[PDB]
Amino acid sequence: GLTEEQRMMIRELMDAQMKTFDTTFSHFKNFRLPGVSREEAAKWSQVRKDLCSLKVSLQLRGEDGSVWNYKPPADSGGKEIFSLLPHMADMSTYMFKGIISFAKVISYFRDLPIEDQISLLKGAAFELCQLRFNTVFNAETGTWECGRLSYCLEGFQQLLLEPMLKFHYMLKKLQLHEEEYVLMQAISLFSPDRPGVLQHRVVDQLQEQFAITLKSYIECNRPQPAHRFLFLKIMAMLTELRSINAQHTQRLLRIQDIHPFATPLMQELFGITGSL
């Protein structure tokens, strides 16, 4: 019951997702791994709380059948809390490159002025990265299954207090289709109120249009009473995700000001110029 414009819109989004989402992470290589007064000190207590919010163990399944497993250390007051940051930066950077390739291919995104493209990517790269991570999140084992790589959360009631983490469990519960995930990525990408956007009217009409398509898709393909208000639930999660984005952006910048680790691409997406 979708229009031909709506059907073509989903086809282009799914096409962009298929071409630019390395779901098996087969081309994520050369990444780093952990080794084998008062105003400058109040930061450390906040950075320490940020890093130990959600900790993950890391597993590498080699192509030969071997398995490396990394269990992170506990906070003992030193620099050991930063051990997984270089790897997290490399993985995030790899996801961001796929996100940027995703946007540049969508026709509605390609047609915007280049400055608005950059403004939209700077605003939504983290959110689309989290949306893609949720499709490989295993809520039964609490693990993000990224091909050869697995990231397992180290009861669980105090862990769902982490907002980003409650988001992953709640979004996974909705059991969305691939078409609904990619429509969420489009709605998040075309948020007309990111810092620096000029064509606020063009982006807003495009976003309302991806939302109408998602609303219509759900109405046509989900009559079950369990999917009542599913569209509104999805839109509420996108609002929460945008807020999680702002929280984690400040967490990153706090950690960056004290222990630099952001890659050049991460610096570009987060406004870091390269000079103190």
Ligand X SMILES: Clc1ccccc1C(c1ccccc1)(c1ccccc1)n1ccnc1
Tell me how far, at minimum, the Cβ of 55 lies from ligand X, in Å: 6
Q: Which of 25, 94, 96, 151 binds ligand X (CB under 6 A)?
A: 151
End-to-end C-alpha distance for the chain, whole angstroms: 55
Tell me how crowded residue 233 is: count the other CB atoms within 10 A of its CB: 15
Is the Cβ–Cβ distance between 198 and 113 less than 8 Å? yes
Shortest-Cβ-distance residue relative to ligand EST: 92
Q: Which residues contact 116 (CB under 8 A, 6 or more apart)?
A: 196, 197, 198, 199, 203
Burial class (CB in 10 A: 0-12, 13-18, 19+), 108: buried
Tell me how far, at minimum, the Cβ of 79 lies from ligand EST, in Å: 14
Binding residues for hyperforin: 92, 130-133, 248
User: Of the listed pieces 22-30, 159-167, 211-219, 233-241, which binds ligand X according to CB under 6 A?
Assistant: 159-167
Q: Which of 6, 17, 20, 92 binds ligand X (CB under 6 A)?
A: 92
Tell me how far, at minimum, the Cβ of 232 lies from ligand EST, in Å: 28
Q: Which of 47, 128, 164, 230 binds ligand X (CB under 6 A)?
A: 164
Q: Which of 94, 85, 78 lies closest to 30, judged by CA?
A: 94
Tell me how far, at minimum, the Cβ of 92 lies from ligand X, in Å: 5
Under the criterion CB under 6 A, does residue 92 sit at the interface with ligand EST? yes
**107, amino acid identity:** S
Q: Which of 109, 133, 181, 190 binds ligand X (CB under 6 A)?
A: 133
Under the criterion CB under 6 A, does residue 251 sit at the interface with ligand EST? yes
Give all strands (DSSP E) within 78-161, no chain letters.
Answer: 137-138, 143-146, 149-153
User: Of the listed pieces 16-24, 181-189, 200-208, 248-256, which binds ligand EST according to CB under 6 A?
Assistant: 248-256
**CA–CA separation, 204 vs 140, rounded Å?**
37
Residues 31 to 70: which contact ligand X by CB under 6 A? 54, 56
Burial class (CB in 10 A: 0-12, 13-18, 19+), 191: middle
Contact footprint for ligand X (CB under 6 A): 54, 56, 88, 92, 130, 133, 144, 151, 162, 164-165, 248
